[PDB]
Structure formats: C-alpha cells, structure tokens
Amino acid sequence: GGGVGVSTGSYDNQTHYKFLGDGWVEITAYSTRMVHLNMPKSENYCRVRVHNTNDTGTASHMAMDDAHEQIWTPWSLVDANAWGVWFQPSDWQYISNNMIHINLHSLDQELFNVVIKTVTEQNTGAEAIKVYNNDLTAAMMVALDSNNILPYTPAIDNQETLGFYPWKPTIPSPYRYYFSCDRNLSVTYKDEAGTITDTMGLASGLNSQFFTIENTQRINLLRTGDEYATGTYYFDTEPIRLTHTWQTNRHLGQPPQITELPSSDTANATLTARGYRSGLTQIQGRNDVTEATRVRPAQVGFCQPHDNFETSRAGPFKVPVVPADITQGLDHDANGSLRYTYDKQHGQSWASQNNKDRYTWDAVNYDSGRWTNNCFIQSVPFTSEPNANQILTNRDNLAGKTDIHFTNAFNSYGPLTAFPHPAPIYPQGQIWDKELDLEHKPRLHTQAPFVCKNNAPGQLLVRLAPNLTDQYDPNSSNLSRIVTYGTFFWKGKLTLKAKMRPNATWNPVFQISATNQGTNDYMSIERWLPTATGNITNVPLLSRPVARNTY
Amino acid sequence: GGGVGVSTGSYDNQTHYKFLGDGWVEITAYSTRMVHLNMPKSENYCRVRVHNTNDTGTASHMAMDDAHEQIWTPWSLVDANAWGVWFQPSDWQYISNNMIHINLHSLDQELFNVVIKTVTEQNTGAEAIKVYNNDLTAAMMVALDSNNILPYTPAIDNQETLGFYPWKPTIPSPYRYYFSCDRNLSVTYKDEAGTITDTMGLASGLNSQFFTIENTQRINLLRTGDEYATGTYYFDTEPIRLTHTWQTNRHLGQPPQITELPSSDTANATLTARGYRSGLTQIQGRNDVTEATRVRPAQVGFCQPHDNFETSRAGPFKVPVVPADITQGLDHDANGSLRYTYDKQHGQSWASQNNKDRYTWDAVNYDSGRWTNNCFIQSVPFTSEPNANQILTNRDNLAGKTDIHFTNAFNSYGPLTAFPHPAPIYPQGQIWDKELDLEHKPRLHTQAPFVCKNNAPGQLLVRLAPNLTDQYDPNSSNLSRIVTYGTFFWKGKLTLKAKMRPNATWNPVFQISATNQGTNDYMSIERWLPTATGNITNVPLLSRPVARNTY
Amino acid sequence: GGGVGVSTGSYDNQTHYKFLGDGWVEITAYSTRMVHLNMPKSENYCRVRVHNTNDTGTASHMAMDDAHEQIWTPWSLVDANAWGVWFQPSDWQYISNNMIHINLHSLDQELFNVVIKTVTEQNTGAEAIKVYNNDLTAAMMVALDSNNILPYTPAIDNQETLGFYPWKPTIPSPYRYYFSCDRNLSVTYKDEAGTITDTMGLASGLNSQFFTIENTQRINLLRTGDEYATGTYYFDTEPIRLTHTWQTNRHLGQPPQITELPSSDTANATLTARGYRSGLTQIQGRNDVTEATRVRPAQVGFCQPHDNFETSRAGPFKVPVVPADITQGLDHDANGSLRYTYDKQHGQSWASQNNKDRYTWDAVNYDSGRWTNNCFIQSVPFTSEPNANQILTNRDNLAGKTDIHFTNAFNSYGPLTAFPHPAPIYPQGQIWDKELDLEHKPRLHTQAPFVCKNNAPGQLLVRLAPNLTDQYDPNSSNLSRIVTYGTFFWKGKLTLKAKMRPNATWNPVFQISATNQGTNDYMSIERWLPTATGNITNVPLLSRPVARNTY
C-alpha cells in the first residue's frame, strides 16, 4: 500500500545474464540512484539569451560563438541515457570480449522513497546552525512525456546525466530547450580591418514555440508514501556490431598470385610483371594491373570536408564528421575523432584538481580511415611518373593559401561508399537517440549507436511543488517561499539482446585485459581501483576488441 | 501490516528442548539483540594499506608484521556466529553433560523495529545540549548475501560478533576484506647486521578483486514500519562428538597378562618376562615384547612442527596447529592450544580495568597430545641401552643452535595417524565456517567445529541510507550530511540436533558443576553471578566432560 | 559398404560449441590426422636393457641413471592424449577466458582410408630410383585394449603423441613397457674415493610379467576398403577449476580494524596496538595479536622436501612435487614447476636449429607457493626478537653442509593443508591419466588434470601385417620380407562439459590477449602466425586467467 514509515521500493543495481539458447544472451541491467533535488531558483518560465560579444566582437573568433536563445524551465529531468549508468566496468569487458552484436530491448523506470525536508536556521548569530526536519505533507511533481511533445534534450550532451557510481548520490539536470532566434555573425580572419555585424534578431511569429510542462503533460503528485512507475518502453532499433573491421579497400578480394614461395623467412615474394598481369582496372591507355589501381567492389571509407563551418539562420556551426580511424598519420579532425569533457561524477578522478577531464576517442575500425597527406588526385589521361602539374598533392596551396589544401574542401562520398557504424563509448556515451522529424533522414547519428525508429523513450521531469509562507500575494513580483529540498530513489531496468561470437581463427584474438601497475599501460589496474581516501576514476574502455572479416 | 507506531516483531531469547524419541533432542535457541548503528565515517569504498615499518624495520621482529591491503566498505555486518550468542551458561552445562553428540540444523534471522534518529545541537554555548528526534522517512539499507559472492569474513576473528548479553545493546562489525598485495620481508635474528627489505608491491592485474555491495546484492530499504526476514537456511554438516577420549596409543588393545594377582593393595602385579612374552613388534633383531615397543593399530596424535613460519607472496605467517592435549609437560605451542583475546561485551568483566581479557584454552582430549621433551628417536639396528650417538633426544642441538631441537622441525603425520576433532569453546568460539574453494581441502578447520559443505549461511550487511542537507554537490570531495544514527532489533533462531549419552560405567562420570565461593576453584559460582553494581563476567566453560572409549 | 576406390570416412578437425542452458556449454572437439606407419624393425618381442655405466660408473652422477629393463614390441600406439591435439590456440583462449570449470565427457576414435604400399628399387645404379605402388591385398593389424590388460603407457611422457598440426602428417609411437629388474646404485659425491656398485639383477620369478598383444587382444585386419571404429568411451572424472586463486594463508578471514581512514592517498592506515588487539592465536605466553601470528582456518600450500631422491629396488628417482607458485623469490624446484622438452611436431619451430625446445611452466595459483629463504622456525617458549640460537633460518647449515638447509628436508604437510589442483598446459600436457591400482591412492596425479576413476580409455595399437617373400623358413633367424609402409587417417571426437564464469567484480579481470609485434611481450602475435616459408610454432598459453575468491 504505502505510507509514512513504509518503503515503496527496493534497491537493485546488479546486472544479470540469461543464456536463452545457442549463442543468445538476454542482458538485464538494473541501476539505482539516490537523487538530490533542490527547489528551483525561479518559479517562472524564462526566455533568456546568451550573446557573448566579448568573444565574437573581435575578428576570427567566430568558432567560439555561443549566441542563442533558450527557454528556462523550473523543471528538472532525470536522464538515464549513458552507458556508464547501466554497467560496471567488468560487465563492459565481458560484453565487449565475447559478443558479436547487441541490441536494445526494453526500458523500465521507477521513483520511490520520496523524502522532502524543510530548512530553518535556528540560533541566529555566529553559530548560525541549520535545522532539518521532514515536511510530511509536501509533494514532488512528476511528469513523463511519452508522446515526445516537448523538445528532446539529451542530458549527456552537457554530461548532466545521472552519475556512474551506484553508491554516490546524484542530481537531476535542469530542463531547458532552444528557442528560435536569428543570428548574423560575419566571417573574418585575424587582425582583419572592418566591422563585425554580430547581431541577433527579434522573435519570429512563424517559428516561435513556447511549451509549458503543465499544459502539455499529466503531472503526478508524490508525497512520502507515494511511488511512481513508468510503464515498460520497448525499443525498435537495429543491433550494432561489436567487432571491428581491419580490412581496407586495398585488402578486398583476391590477392595477386605470387610466382613462387620465398626461399627464406626474410625474403619477399614476387608477382607477375604488371605489364603481363591479368586483372580489371578503370585506368585508360595503360597496360598494367597494380594492387593500387585494380578495381575494388566498393569505396571503404571516404574523404570528408574537415573543419567545415556552415551557416544557416542561427549562426556558424561545424559540420559533423563520421568517426573513422585516425591512420598512422594520426590526423584526428579529418577522421572526426570524438573528444569528451566530463566531471568527477561521470569520470575524471576525485584526486584531480582540474575542473574537468578530457579524453579523445579514436575509432577502433582500422579500415575506413583516411590519411590525408598521402591522398592525391592525378590528371587524365593517366600517366606513370606524373610531373608537378599532373598531380594534386596535399602539399598544394588551395586558393593561394598556405594552410588550406584540397582535402579540406574535398568530398568523395558517393554511391560506392561503405563504412562501419561507429562504436559505443562505455563510461561516457549516449546509448540511444531520437530520430529527427525531417522527411529525408541521416543514415546514422554521429554520437549515438542506437536510433529510435518511431518514438523515443519519454523524458522524465520532476520538480518540487512550491511551499508557500503565510503571506502570498499573487500579483507580487518577488515570491517568498519555504526553503525546501528533497531526495528520492531512481531505479531503472534496461534489457538487451546479444549474441556470442564465434572463433574460427587459429591465432589468439585481442581481448580487453587488466594489467599490472608500475607500467604506464592504459589498462593498468589501479585506475579501476579505489584509492586510500576513496577516490575513484572511471575511464573509457576500448570497444570492439575482436577483428572481423569484412569481405 | 506495519507502520509508524506498530511493532514489527517480538523479543524471544529463550532456549527450548524437544525430546523427539529415544535419546534424540531438538534444541531450538532463540537470540535477540538491540543493535546500535552509526552513520558510516565515509561514504566511499576505500583501498587502504597498513604497513608498519617501526615494528618490522628492525631485525627479528618478523612475527609482528601486520602489513596488508584491505578494502574498507561503508557497510556493517551483523554476525551471529559465536556460541556465546545463542546460549546462556546453564544451557551449555546441560548440553555438555548429557549429550554424546550434536549437530547444526537450521538458522533464521530477522530485523524489526527499525528506529532512525537525527542529532541537532541546540543552545550553542557552554551548555551545548544535543537534541534527539525521529526521522520517520529515513531508511536503513539491508543486504543478505546468500550466494557468498563477497569475501567471507567471520566477525569472531576480531571478536566483533554480537554481544553475549541479552539485555545489553550491541553494535555491528564494519565490513571489510583483504585485497591482493605482495610483500617482501626478509628474515633476520636479533642484532643481526644487514638491511631488511620490508617492502610492499604494486596492484596486480591478475589478482585484483574489488567488490561492491551495491553491484553484487539486492538491497532492501527499511523505514520504521518495515521489517526484514531471512529465509530459513539449512546446514549440511557432520555432527561433533561431545565426549572426550582419554585413551593413548599405549592404551590400545589387550593388556599383557599378569602372572598372578597381587597379594596386597600396595603391591604391583608382574608380567611374563619380556624375553618370553608373546606379541607383535616391528623392531628387528631383538627377542622382546614390551608395552612400549608392541605394535598398535594406529598412531593416536602426531608430532607437529611448532612455531613454524612459512612465507608465501603475502608475508610470513604461522602455520596452524591441530589442538591437542598439553601433556604433564605443559608445553602449549607444540600441541597448539588456542589463546583468545576479548572485550567486556564478549567476556572479561566490567570490573576489569584492562582493555582486553585473555584465556588459553587447553584441549580436553587427553589421548592425542605430545610431550616433547620425552619424545625421542633411536638408531637402527635397534638396541637396548643406546649410547649418546645412538639416540636423538629433545636436548640435542639441531643445526648447532641451543634452543632449536628436532621436535621443532619434526613432522610425524602419516597414513596411520588418528586424532580427535577439537572441541567447541562456549562463550568465545566460532560455531560454523565456510569451506575453502580449493580443490584439495583440509580435513578440519582449526577454530570452527562445523564446516559448511556446500554453501555457508549468508552474511547480513546493513548501513544507513545517506541523509543529505539542502546543499549537495556531486563533484565535491567533502560531503556534508545530516548526523544520523539508528537502532534495530536482530532476532535469530538456531536449531540443533543432539542425542543423549548412555552411561555403562560403574563409577560416577565427571560433570560440570558449580562450586561454592571462597575457594579459588575455576567453577566458583560468583563468576556467573552479577555484582553489586551490575558487573558480570562470562568465562570459558570446559567442554566434553564425560570420557569415552576410543577402542 | 566400402571397397577399393571408396573412402571409408571423412575429415573433421573443427571444434563446436553448444549452449545448453544457463551458463552450460557442451564442447565437441573433432581432430583428424594422417598417420604414417612403417613396417616394424623387428618381428619379435624383445626384452632389452639399457645400462649406462659411462654415466653412472663415476661418482655423484646418480641423478642421470637411465638403467632399466623393457619389453620392445613390434606394435605401435596411436595416442591422442595431449591438449594440443584437440584444440587450436584460439579455442583454448576462448575456453580459458570465459569458463569457470570444465570436465571430460566422452571420447570416440576411428581409423579409415587405409593405404598400404610396397617399395621396389628399379634401375639399379647411380640413379637408384624407388618405385611406389599399391598392394591392394595387404592388411593393417589393429587392436584396442578396452580392459587395460596391457601396461598403460602414455605417449606424451616422451612427447610421442600425435602432432598438433591438422595439416601435417604424423607418426605413431612404438609400443613398449617396463619389465621388472633390480638395480643397485651406490650413493656418492663428487671426487669421492671408493667403488660404485652399479649393478643390475637377474630376472625375478616373482615379478616377471611378459605380455603379448596377440595373446591378450582381439586384432582386426584392415585392408584398403576396411575401416575401424572404437565405441564411445565415457569418462568418470571430476571437473577442474579454470580460475586461479590469489588468496594466501595471510589473506584469509577478516582483516584487522583500522583506527581511522587515512588522510591522504599516500598515507597508510594504522591498527589497534598489538598488545590491545582482540583475536585468536596459538602462541603461548605473549599478549599480542599480529597479522602473522593470528590463527587461520587452514594451511594454504605446504613446504615440500625438494630435490628428494628416494631409492626402491629399481634405483634412485626424484620424488614428485605438487606444482605451486614460484614466489617473488623465483625458486622453481621447491615449488615443483614443470619443465617440458618437445620437438617441432609438438611445438618448437621449424625455424629452430636445436633438436628440442624447452619451456618451464610456472604455476598460475599465487596463493599456495612457498618462498624458502623467508621461511623460518622459531624456538619455544615463543619470544619476540629471537637471538641466533632461538630461530632456524634458511641460511643455517644442516648437518654441517653449506648448501643443504632445513627446507630441503622439511615436510609441513598435514591435516590442515589445503592447496589448489594444478592446471592444464595447453599445447603440451596430458589430458587424462589412469589411476594406480594400489589400495591407498594419491589425492592427485602431478602431470594430468583428469584421472579416470574406474577404467581408462583404451590404448589403440597398430602394426602392418607381415608381407613375406617367396622364400620363408620358419626356423631361420633372419627374416626376409617385402619393404612395406602404410598410411591411414585417425579421427577422434572429444566432448567436454563447461560452465561460463560469473563476473561480480567492479574492475576488469585479466584476460588472455594477443599483442602487437615489435615488443617482446610473451603474447606477441607473430608467434601464432606462419612465416614466409611456412614455419609455425605453438607455444604454451597461460591458463586460469581470471582470479577467484578462495574464502
């Protein structure tokens, strides 16, 4: 039933594995958090703009423009979407090593053991002690948006999701969303003479959308004995592959036939002379077949315009880039490696004195990357040994500029392009994402492995109902109210489908393994262990350890 | 149902006896305690090491090395395993006198009448009074580990088990477990010149295990009206014998036949001359049969290496020793007598000004002990009247050292060895123990009479759920929280099977009996009685009073 | 049906995995080999002795004595018992990483596609060409001993088992067994004056056993179209644990309670003073409790007499030693680490110019090892700070000899001893073994994980039936016969039961992983890969990667 002095739920953070048959595993991940909620700093919906002129008023600083318009709401959201919420590091190891693909099934959520307290300051003076006592009749307002009427607002974008540590309490993310506003910011370079427009526009009768939680939602009122339960949500998603691909566009198909086996282990094999070699090529006018010029089934990976900034009405923004392997040439931005910034709750370490910690994720698929300094375009009719005018290298100045080269603006994407879908990032990364409502849709989102086809799981919104003092004027601009905060337990259940991997290879596969301390190896075990004072860190685990044959 | 203002359980500490048939008794022992729980001194799992260089940095002090590595947890354990929890002294007398063997059957446990209070300090100043008031919505976290996933950690090792006095409240033991770390400590003697290594190692990727209660367990949340009940656990164990054996290896079999009965009560009987005596001996080349040299069915008891310190990766440790009778020669360590150190809650007396009280338990089986100064080895071919070179005594210096003798290093254990299983120690001693997970297992554990064959009874873990103030930063290193403590009642039911003893002897058997005060006899009654100020002591009762025929 | 020109079997070397339910896996390993058989070098049973006087005629060389007596038989045995026959390296990785325990179920064997050819030398002269042609009517003799009447003779002892490479043909091991003979070899040291007896004895009417394959067995005759199939054999065995134990005798039980948590990550925690500490110890006369001297449930591991040579009638031999961890002190022989010697067929590399390759296997269980220089025995009554006469160290000269110390002769094994069962060695190691027919049996065999309780799987014996020329005299001492050899396919199916491991730990477990070439790390991948000329090596894989809680 429930009431004062009776718990409305239980605490389960453990993860379970059922083996359903041959190779198939049902993974059930329970997660529970104690959540700390503060009375909102304003009772009102606010429409606020951040316009930073100090940064953008001076030339060439375009890329740091923050200017936008947002609706601030008194509500806060409980957002469970990150991988670090659901699993402990060893679970991720076990899944990553043993399973060929995995998929989302269902999601459950609960709120229980609501506690609301009021704060009074007794013994006013140098002592200034605070007294804490229960308000048994106070309520917490809870709303779930199942129909996704409100703007969809993943909390992991700002790393505001529930913490990754079962035994540490966590806080909600305050709910907010963008509002339509036009921005004009002119494009300049460093120390350029002129004037930067740097203006924002008036509200648009066309594009204005102001949503209210109270008008769009059914709000449940939870006192202490109350509990709230979301129904079971079911994902419709495609499974993601947990094995990386090594196999480049030059590894596809049948190798050339060697003339004979080499005599010693140090010797190299030889091939039929390229003039006499059989094969298929799209080069005209030459009788040759070379491993580089032979036709392949598809383009694996593609060149992407990198550090591309395009401007629509809202302002400049960087065009996303499909994550691919940074090659031996290490260039990160061409291949669009992800870079995370996160706090102690989600990562970092309590030993760290910095405000945030940063990690650059490199794609684990060694096939589709591009190494730009070694890319080139050659003139037609094709020739062996091109001269300087017959080949375009990455050392060539585009539009007479020293640091701009054709690979900056070059886009090779086309019908023949094939690339792997990027990989989940265990402690910090977005599990699922809502699909855009546009008619023509992207083939993949960049940050999130799973995209909900029809309807995303709802956003769970909470706030404290206001406690009013004895004096309340509805027409007053300032509102006096009782200082109040609350805590509650969030529990959720995430079910996944996965399948065990085969091993057909003679040789041992790569695995995620712990390593002794004292060597600086990334997997050195002490990083997953507590310290003497209880400091702990949770760092990104490599994913997709095991290789796969593409073709 | 339960709620605020309704008790969720009852208090039964009394012990019951059912007589089920011929000689068979079902013993049901109820025990109840009020338990006092403090908010944990840290919210974090901590990995801490104690390395005492002051003791081990100087030579010959090896035996006092404390160095290890442990995981400190915020959780506390309620541990009912000691004999002093379950029985009052007269119950132990009654069982020990009348019963030939006894065995464990089942165990139940309950938690009820949870009370949680918060502490505030009013009237700040010289008065500095504390105010106590109920937090009705606060919860206590409870976890039972049935599957024994967590490291198994008997609280009686440190004497941290629940107190032995029904009317006195008791406290939990904080839960902690060892963590893998390597230690190097060199071996030295007193005033030896050199350097002692005395180092500890870095964490091991191989051996590191860090467990979390939240990740491995299902935690129940208990408010005031809530109660928790363990299911019934069932022991699989072998019964233990409650009668001692007197019968030495020289008492086995048929005595020699006397020539004639003696003439007076003071006279001694005589035997057939050893040269003419019939018998069986393993001595070669002599025609004799003596009571000492005649063959016996088995070796009763065996010589043990004593004060043996062996070193694996973790450090030096003393090898355990099967408890046996300290003989007329009184030597304790050769026969491995147990020595307990315990506090007022478990023993001692509230009249005592010492921090702890100490008792040395001597084995009650008078057969299998070894008296070392009278042990010797004799050369082959055997001879009567050996000279100094033909016999090895315990006065002989081994490796040219004054205080080391062969009985230190000598191990006689073999296929013919038979010894009694040691005995339970009533007020302070471990009732049951979990079996090691190794493949080749010890025949008995040294401290505990009962060893659980398959799965030990679960460990019962508790903590207070954190109470947070109005200001909580998840990323802050320091955590401010409301001062909170709680109390609850622990109740348990331990069922035992026992069988009454026969008496076939003409003469009266030895019994455990009280004795008048004024003589210093160990059983003097005032030790079991309260004092004027209420001080009470509970001291070890001898066990296995009644003799038994071995063969 | 079968006949000339029809194959009687198929080639399956692949390994299969069925998932039967929760955590349970049925592993089916097929293995197939082409076997090359030569006409035996003698048609007779021969009783031969090797007596090497050159080695043992001179003092101190006792340990190299090879002297024995054997029955040489014309038969050869096909022996499938090694782990390297059944699995490819990645299969062993997969099993070793993911499975907590494993057990033998059944064994099948087949012989098919028998080919027998005769050799004639045409064009006698400098050319001396050999001609090969089929003898269609020739037969191969096949016998399986199900009842184990013949002496049991594992071929892996000499590393004569079928090769580890599916695509490489292999040869049988010629069948032979020991014959009873007495040897006298006196014990001497280097450059000792005297005479060494070094004799062997005459045949014993008591102990002589001469077995014949033809008299004890039913032999099947296989021509080309014939095939042979063993029935299904079923093992009765205990499963073996695939997880190592780290937990030393000093890691057992509850750690001491620290006074307070340390202030900084560099600080060490402190414990209650040993004089005031509660606990249980077997030391008498001291009021202390130390981590080294506190009582533990059992002895984990034990000291073993090492390089112990005992002599029965047959000669000197080294006493086996239970494999245990070689500690930080690295001493191998005290802990009995295994050392293998093997050829290219079973290992090594075809790049190697040495005749054999050698590997020393160190036990993977980090608990039960002994580090001998740090072991010591201390005098009674116990004292802190012993002087030189009060402690026996490993630097102390035993019997006045420089290099002999008490740990050489010291045996701590007893009732309290517990140790792990050693681990399987993947490429080279014996899977199963027959149990000795003695009444009192060893608790484990040293080399083989699995011991057959009742009846071992039969030995499969083969030979070519003799081809006789036109001239045959039964009474002639020399036998002229047609040069003949044969080939056949051996196929076998080994079924195993295994169970997946749980992971309850927060931190990542250690795993077997491949590693990039260019670092000298043991797991560097190129060792599992072919070379340019086709050379390949198969090296021992570490086993039991994942840690386990002992207690």
Ligand SMILES: CC(=O)N[C@@H]1[C@@H](O)[C@H](O[C@@H]2O[C@H](CO)[C@H](O)[C@H](O[C@]3(C(=O)O)C[C@H](O)[C@@H](NC(C)=O)[C@H]([C@H](O)[C@H](O)CO)O3)[C@H]2O)[C@@H](CO)O[C@H]1O
């Ligand atoms: C090209 C050049 O001149 N220098 C580069 C250098 O920029 C690059 O990274 C630097 O070098 C250090 C090497 O110890 C780190 O890699 C630093 O990166 C940090 C970061 O991104 O801020 C530090 C941070 O602490 C790290 N993360 C954690 C959880 O500790 C991350 C992390 O290692 C990476 O993100 C991995 O993806 O890196 C940065 O100052 C180095 C890279 O080796 O190469 C030089 O040539």
Ligand SMILES: CC(=O)N[C@@H]1[C@@H](O)[C@H](O[C@@H]2O[C@H](CO)[C@H](O)[C@H](O[C@]3(C(=O)O)C[C@H](O)[C@@H](NC(C)=O)[C@H]([C@H](O)[C@H](O)CO)O3)[C@H]2O)[C@@H](CO)O[C@H]1O
């Ligand atoms: C050999 C020698 O030089 N002297 C020994 C002496 O060590 C030994 O014990 C001492 O003598 C007194 C006699 O009154 C006690 O036996 C002391 O032992 C204590 C102990 O272990 O600390 C005192 C303690 O108070 C006692 N326990 C309780 C509950 O009161 C225990 C207890 O009596 C024993 O453990 C019984 O097992 O003993 C100690 O100072 C004596 C023993 O008689 O013999 C001398 O020769």
Ligand SMILES: CC(=O)N[C@@H]1[C@@H](O)[C@H](O[C@@H]2O[C@H](CO)[C@H](O)[C@H](O[C@]3(C(=O)O)C[C@H](O)[C@@H](NC(C)=O)[C@H]([C@H](O)[C@H](O)CO)O3)[C@H]2O)[C@@H](CO)O[C@H]1O
């Ligand atoms: C104590 C001392 O004076 N020297 C030891 C030394 O004996 C010991 O081993 C030697 O050092 C080399 C180091 O490269 C090898 O370990 C050699 O061992 C061999 C062997 O057993 O013959 C060589 C062999 O090729 C190796 N096996 C394979 C398959 O390649 C094996 C193998 O590495 C081991 O058996 C592993 O168990 O070793 C030997 O000459 C070294 C060990 O590091 O330590 C010195 O201190």
